[PDB]
Write a protein that binds this ligand. Structure first.
Ligand SMILES: O=C(COc1cccc(F)c1)NC1CC1
Lengths: 237, 300
């Protein structure tokens, strides 16, 4: 059924699974109109679909043109998410199709289940984890490809860069969620932490900087601090 | 007017005939039920004094043969039978009526309740839901499961209601996933009405039969089926106007007749609130919404 702390190691077994986060699919800026009314303007979005074991990220970019002339866009966005995830699964060879899809928001369950009626062996699951995947657009290179897109487009990334050469997927996911939590709680501090030192670069083919093992521990500690911090500043503790 | 005579009444039992019921005491001189209105299906049902577990009963139509009840001390229940010999039936029944050992079906002449609950119920269709083809009458009890319930174990003792499942390839057209899940008109009108039921009368008749099995036997799967068939209409943007008008009448009399003390288990809060307040047809069930709100405002 639902996914929580009791079964956190299931993510890193050998059953193919994908997380799907739809929080950045329908994005808007809200503004005043000349008549003093309020209007929205949509901007490009993305479906964040991620294999937590391999780090493979199927970033489906949602171009604003898909909303043209449509009604109830927050609701359409969920079904559009489901449609595009269903399309991805169908494009993958059978031995690459997930055995489970885990949705980060419960409102995605019915839209995805309906789109995947053709795949009755694929389990559609919620989670009780509060995962920070909405902060994916704080990753500069992901944000860049979404905002530059002029048409619908799937871009493939490895959100772990080369980390799996040195650490396990359990540790790689925990780093990723720590980084994304930090970016979500205080993006500027998080980004300052990551890029303060000019001598640690981000390789062209990577998303994150080329930290050594020792540097990652310092970074990880600095991001923990940030998250405990902002939690004070928030709750005055 | 027709008669369901009894051999005797050897065990204390509450007997129901349609929406009426009376207590018969162990070995009381009871020999059946008379003046039963022709033209309607009927149900005669039982709840033993000793074991309130298992309400059970027999759907039947007096036009389809002469029926008598004889308790079976081996199987432990009141069984419906057919007397092949028409002459013996008249001779035994007349004997019983002269000695006044029968209760009279007690219909008030103003009262259309039973008609209104059974308007579209036909014995021929009942027998396709309750498969026991050697008998003209159909047995139902509390514990009988439905075909869909056995998909989620004895196939012969099942209620073969039409399977309705909103998240099914039957209900959802490829490429219309969102359209068809949020507006079930395709499933109601094309799949179910045009495809399976053929007309709204068959649809309504199953719906009414499901309700009556739920109310009379506390048959849980019947209750599920009645609610599903309401929801399938309420969740369709496009429903013929006469079907909605009739549905409002149907439900009105069902809600009117439900025992007040059983509303907590026969009425599904989620379905009713959705149908009355959120669904496409939220404004289309004036009579039903009015009785529901004056009789069971708690549910809403
Ligand atoms: O028992 C009966 C008939 O029993 C009846 C028939 C008609 C009305 C009635 F009250 C009782 N036939 C053969 C012996 C088994």
């Amino acid at each position: 059924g639902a996914m929580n702390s009791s079964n956190y190691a299931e993510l890193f077994n050998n059953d193919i699974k994908l997380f799907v986060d739809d929080t950045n699919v329908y994005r808007v800026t809200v503004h005043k109109t000349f008549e003093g009314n309020v209007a929205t303007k949509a901007i490009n979005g993305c479906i964040f679909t991620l294999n937590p074991k391999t780090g493979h990220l199927f970033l489906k970019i949602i171009h604003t043109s898909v909303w043209a002339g449509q009604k109830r866009l927050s609701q359409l966005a969920k079904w559009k998410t489901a449609e595009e995830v269903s399309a991805l699964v169908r494009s993958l060879p059978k031995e690459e199709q997930p055995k489970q899809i885990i949705v980060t928001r419960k409102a995605m369950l019915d839209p995805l289940e309906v789109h995947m009626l053709d795949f009755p062996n694929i389990a559609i699951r919620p989670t009780e984890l509060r995962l920070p995947f909405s902060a994916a657009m704080s990753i500069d290179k992901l944000s860049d490809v979404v905002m530059k897109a002029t048409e619908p487009q799937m871009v493939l990334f490895n959100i772990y860069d080369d980390w799996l050469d040195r650490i396990s997927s359990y540790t790689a996911f925990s780093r990723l969620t720590l980084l994304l939590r930090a970016l979500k709680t205080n993006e500027e501090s998080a980004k300052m932490i990551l890029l303060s030192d000019p001598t640690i670069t981000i390789k062209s083919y990577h998303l994150w900087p080329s930290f050594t093992d020792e540097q990652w521990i310092t970074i990880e500690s600095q991001m923990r601090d940030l998250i405990l911090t902002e939690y004070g500043r928030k709750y005055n503790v | 007017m027709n008669t369901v005579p009894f051999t005797s009444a050897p065990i204390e039992v509450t007997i129901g005939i349609d929406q009426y019921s009376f207590n018969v005491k162990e070995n009381q001189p009871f020999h059946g039920i008379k003046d039963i209105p022709i033209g309607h299906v009927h149900v005669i049902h039982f709840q033993h004094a000793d074991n309130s577990s298992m309400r059970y009963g027999y759907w039947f139509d007096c036009r389809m043969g002469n029926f008598y009840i004889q308790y079976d001390p081996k199987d432990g229940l009141y069984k419906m039978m057919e007397e092949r010999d028409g002459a013996k039936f008249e001779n035994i029944v007349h004997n019983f009526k002269e000695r006044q050992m029968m209760v009279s079906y007690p219909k008030i002449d103003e009262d259309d309740t039973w008609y209104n609950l059974t308007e579209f119920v036909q014995m021929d269709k009942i027998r396709k839901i309750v498969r026991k083809d050697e008998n003209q009458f159909s047995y139902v009890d509390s514990s009988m499961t439905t075909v869909q319930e056995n998909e989620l174990s004895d196939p012969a003792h099942s209620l073969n209601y039409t399977v309705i499942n909103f998240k099914s390839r039957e209900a959802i057209r490829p490429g219309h996933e969102m359209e068809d899940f949020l507006d079930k008109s395709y499933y109601l009108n094309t799949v179910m009405l045009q495809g399976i039921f053929k007309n709204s009368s068959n649809y309504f008749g199953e719906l009414q039969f499901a309700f009556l099995n739920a109310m009379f036997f506390g048959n849980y799967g019947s209750s599920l089926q009645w609610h599903a068939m309401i929801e399938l209409i309420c969740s369709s943007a496009t429903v013929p106007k006469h079907m909605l008008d009739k549905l409002d009448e149907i439900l009105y009399y069902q809600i009117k007749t439900l025992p007040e003390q059983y509303s907590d288990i026969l009425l599904n809060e989620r379905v009713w609130n959705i149908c009355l307040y959120s669904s496409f047809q939220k404004n289309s069930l004036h009579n039903t919404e009015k009785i529901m709100e004056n009789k069971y405002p708690e549910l809403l």
